[PDB]
Amino acid sequence: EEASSTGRNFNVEKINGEWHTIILASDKREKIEDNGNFRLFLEQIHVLEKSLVLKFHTVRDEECSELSMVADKTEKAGEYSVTYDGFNTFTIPKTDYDNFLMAHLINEKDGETFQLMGLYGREPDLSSDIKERFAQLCEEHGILRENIIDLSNANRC
Numbered sequence: 001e002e003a004s005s006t007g008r009n010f011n012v013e014k015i016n017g018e019w020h021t022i023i024l025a026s027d028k029r030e031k032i033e034d035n036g037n038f039r040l041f042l043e044q045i046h047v048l049e050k051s052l053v054l055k056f057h058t059v060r061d062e063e064c065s066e067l068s069m070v071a072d073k074t075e076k077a078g079e080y081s082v083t084y085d086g087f088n089t090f091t092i093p094k095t096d097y098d099n100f101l102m103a104h105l106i107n108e109k110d111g112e113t114f115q116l117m118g119l120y121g122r123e124p125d126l127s128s129d130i131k132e133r134f135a136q137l138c139e140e141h142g143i144l145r146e147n148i149i150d151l152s153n154a155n156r157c
């Protein structure tokens with residue numbers, strides 16, 4: 001079964017655990033390029049009562065550094081918010097729990113905004129079919145494929 005965090009049958013506990021950043025996308029490409037603050041390699045999600053603890057690592061000159069964030073449920077079911085390089089809110093428009101998870105995030109900083117979409121997998125890579133389904137979801141949000149970056153060959157330290 002596949003669900004959306006904003007959907008009725010969403011079971012948040014099933015997204016608990018190991019995850020890896022497979023692809024990142026944004027309508028402001030620089031945010032996810034080599035030294036962008038949003039090029040985050042997810043490692044795990046810990047589901048709590050009213051929040052999610054996210055553990056990522058970033059890379060600089062080939063050196064990895066850890067970083068955690070706490071995303072809190074907002075008043076919309078399926079939506080979370082977190083402060084990180086501005087104010088962010090995000091939902092999970094699609095996940096199948098066992099293989100992939102697709103997130104859509106809105107960042108607001110200095111009075112501006114931008115969209116970020118991420119494809120995460122239980123293993124360090126995903127099938128080309130799942131990657132194509134992710135490209136279609138990006139297109140539904142006005143994000144061009146040239147703004148979609150596959151990081152599956154650079155997500156392990």
Ligand SMILES: CCCCCCCCO
Nearest residue numbers: 038039040090103116118
């Ligand atoms: C469950 C994780 C949602 C996506 C957060 C991505 C932030 C860095 O690109």
